[PDB]
Amino acid sequence: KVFGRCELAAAMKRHGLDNYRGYSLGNWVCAAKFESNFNTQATNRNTDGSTDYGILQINSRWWCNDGRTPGSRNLCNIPCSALLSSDITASVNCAKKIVSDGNGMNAWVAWRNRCKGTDVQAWIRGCRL
């Protein structure tokens, strides 16, 4: 599924991401835009063998099991295919674990380079929340 901007903002609010660990809703919408272009089915292969999955591009070396990343962990205890669903429950629950790991939203390279230090409120402007 390709989400619209305000549609995704509403869904992440219903799933408890607004102000989770201190990160306002616009941060999460900005990260999804530059990681996946709002597409739940996005996949990208990395230059270490691992693969990133889903709307928040969660990586198979640490967070999910895809059966082809040797020596990796499965810290969210999920098959990576669960992260491609039109329902974002699995992506949200795993993202909550990632952002609590110590480095906050800096775990997402696109957030640190394209969202951090910008007016992220703009990403939820005009939405009915």
Annotated active-site residue 7? The verdict is no
In the complex with Cl ion, the residue whose CB is nearer, 84 or 107, is 107
Report d(CA 11, CA 103) in Å as an integer.
25
Tell me if 53 sits within 8 A of 76, measured CB to CB.
Answer: no
- Least distance in angstroms from the C-beta of 129 to Na ion: 35
What is the enclosing helix (H) or strand (E) of 13? helix 5-14
Which is catalytic among the residues 7, 18, 48, 52? 52
Tell me if 39 sits within 8 A of 57, measured CB to CB.
Answer: no
In the complex with Na ion, the residue whose CB is nearer, 36 or 59, is 59
Angle between helices 5-14 and 25-36 (to 10 degrees): 130
Q: Is 79 in the site for Cl ion (CB under 5 A)?
A: no
In the complex with Cl ion, the residue whose CB is nearer, 23 or 34, is 23
Annotated active-site residue 35? The verdict is yes
Q: Is 104 in the site for Cl ion (CB under 5 A)?
A: yes
Q: Please list the active-site residues.
A: 35, 52
